[PDB]
Copies of this chain bind each other. A is one copy, B any other.
Amino acid sequence: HMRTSQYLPADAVVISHQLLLRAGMIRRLASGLYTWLPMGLRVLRKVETIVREEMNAAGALEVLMPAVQPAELWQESGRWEQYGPELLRLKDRHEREFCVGPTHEEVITDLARNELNSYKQLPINFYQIQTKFRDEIRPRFGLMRGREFIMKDAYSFHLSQDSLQQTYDGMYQAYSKIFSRLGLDFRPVQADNGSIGGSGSHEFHVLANSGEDDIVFSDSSDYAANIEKAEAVPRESARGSATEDMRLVDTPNTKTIAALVDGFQLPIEKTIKTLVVHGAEEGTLVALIVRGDHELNEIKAANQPLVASPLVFASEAEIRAAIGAGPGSLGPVNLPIACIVDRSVALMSDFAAGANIEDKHYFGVNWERDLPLPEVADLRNVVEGDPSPDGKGTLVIKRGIEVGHIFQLGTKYSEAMKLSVLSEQGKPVNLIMGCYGIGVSRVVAAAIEQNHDERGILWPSALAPFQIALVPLKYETESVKQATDKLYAELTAAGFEVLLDDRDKKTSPGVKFADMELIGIPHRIVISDRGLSEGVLEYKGRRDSESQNLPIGELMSFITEKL
């Protein structure tokens, strides 16, 4: 028998973390390090089973690579340094250097250059379900920002871009099947691939109110993207006419949009933010301008050719030396550095701008009349109700928990690590690669974030640790004991996963009921002598308002249907 006597705050702030602790599914060992207790492991394994099945069905080959990895491989890719401090670095007893793997691009590439020597082996897609380590600066949110976590990571190798796309498409489809079978409300979205436009990366998000990531959808089309990636187009069709002459105004204590809007009674749509960043050309600055009610999108900013990637903001001293004034008094008029303005900015008229002189602004600025319009680009974040960039409907912003991310890597790794195979024609080809990650331990948490109530966890059917809780009242009575054990055996025989509450009188029936519901068991059966005498059992669903009575004989028929 599987029995309750065996199986069953402060740092816990999100609901999934709180309930995983309370339901006896995990325990903290240290910052970002959790043990799966017996009840939680059951859930984790059900996630793992569905992932494996769908990866297998998509033709991927399961491997299992080491956690500890030699530094030399990471030095080949440059990530030994470039990965940053989330990379856990160490030395062994021989003073040799290693990391604990946060991901396995380098290891799989090393494998690939030894094991792939014929075009007849391609395409091929290896995956593993394996424990990663990432030295997250502030481990939090329980399983969702852990240090040690389970990921399914897959890596595909190809002789052509078109081949990669075929596998990538299959992985996207597989992912959809995975999250559907896990019974999660989820959405795939376009994600940043490090260039303007393109479609070489997608995320899969579980929809939840606590979700850290903003995702954007058209209400009328298939348009879907992370806010990092979401294309912003202007609400206005044309630039307004010039109705005011430009003029220099004294503006002491005016260094924010609010101070400008409230101080001088300007509409926010007549103001701008000027952000100064480092240019790609060494020692240069670029000014990026968005309208006052908007925000600079730092991915869009870095993806501009003129702008250094990754994105570095100019210091105040850099700004003052270059421009002749500091933050708060900046603008495009008499600006001695390169400038890029957001699409919305290009359509503005009679607008205000810091004068590039301390504590002054120009009012009544108009493009063309008072200064040339600079380069225009999509620089801003979309906001709720903006037009869909495909021209079909308007945008809506939801919160999402990232559980999957897929990537087209081109030849980044194969070039650096000399992974090449001869074509049928005999041309050496650097293999084109994709990689595909699911946060498996994250998924367990994400499910609770999405699915919970006042009584505790609600699992999707695929994730429930057990299907049926048997709650005997006074299990010490032979009639009950026999009636319960018989029920356990039949149900277990019929392939159902049953938990038998074997706890003594010192655990009340109410406590028992609340426990089975906290843990998220979808069905309970209650056995008692009062009921055995009348040939009835007491059944209740997890999301049923009321219990009901079930003739002992019809039970198996009735339970089978539900499950």
A residues adjacent to B (C-beta < 8 A): 5-7, 27, 29-31, 33-38, 41, 44, 59, 61-70, 85-86, 88-90, 92-93, 96, 98, 100, 107, 110-111, 114-115, 120-121, 124, 126, 131, 133, 135, 137, 147-148, 503-504
Contact = CB atoms under 8 A, between A and B. Distances in A.
Given A36-B63, A120-B503, 5 more contacts: A6-B124, A29-B65, A30-B66, A30-B98, A100-B100
Nearest to A36: B64
B5 A121 contact: yes
A61 B38 contact: yes
Nearest to A34: B66
Nearest to A7: B61
A36 to B, nearest CB: 4
List of 7 A-B pairs having minimum Cβ-Cβ separation, nearest first: A90-B90, A36-B64, A38-B61, A33-B66, A30-B70, A35-B65, A85-B93
A279 B107 CA distance: 51
A393 to B, nearest CB: 44
A257 to B, nearest CB: 36
B111 A70 contact: no
Nearest to A69: B29
B29 A135 contact: no
14 contacts: A5-B120, A6-B59, A7-B61, A27-B115, A30-B69, A31-B96, A33-B69, A35-B65, A36-B64, A38-B63, A41-B63, A68-B88, A93-B137, A120-B504
Contacts of A38: 61-63, 126
Q: Which of A36, A64, A90, A110 has most B Cβ within 10 Å?
A: A64
A38 B44 CA distance: 22
Contacts of A41: 62-64
Nearest to A108: B35
A239 to B, nearest CB: 50
A107 B67 contact: no
A114 B27 contact: yes
A63 B34 contact: no
A62 B6 CA distance: 11
A121 B503 CA distance: 10
Given A29-B70, A111-B35, A93 B135 contact: yes
A413 to B, nearest CB: 16
Contacts of A124: 6
A37 B115 contact: yes
A66 B115 contact: no
Contacts of A114: 27
Contacts of A5: 120-121
A4 B63 CA distance: 15
Nearest to A120: B5
A131 B5 CA distance: 29
Contact of A35 (B61, B70, B92, B107): B107
A131 B133 CA distance: 13
A80 B70 CA distance: 24
Contacts of A61: 6-7, 38
Contact of A92 (B36, B88, B131): B88
Contacts of A100: 67-68, 90, 100
Contacts of A85: 93
A86 B35 CA distance: 23
A277 to B, nearest CB: 27
A73 to B, nearest CB: 8
A504 B120 CA distance: 9
A371 to B, nearest CB: 47
Nearest to A29: B66
B135 A92 contact: yes
B64 A44 contact: yes
Contacts of A147: 68, 92
Contacts of A115: 27, 37
A465 to B, nearest CB: 12
Contact of A33 (B37, B68, B93, B135): B68
A93 B86 CA distance: 8
Contacts of A88: 68, 90, 92
Contacts of A29: 65-66, 69-70, 107, 110
A133 B68 contact: yes
Nearest to A91: B90
A10 to B, nearest CB: 15
A87 to B, nearest CB: 9
A37 B88 CA distance: 25
A66 B133 CA distance: 10
Contacts of A503: 120
A145 to B, nearest CB: 14
A74 to B, nearest CB: 12
Contacts of A33: 66, 68-70
A115 B5 CA distance: 11
A6 B121 contact: yes
A126 B38 CA distance: 8
Contacts of A37: 63, 115
A98 B86 CA distance: 15
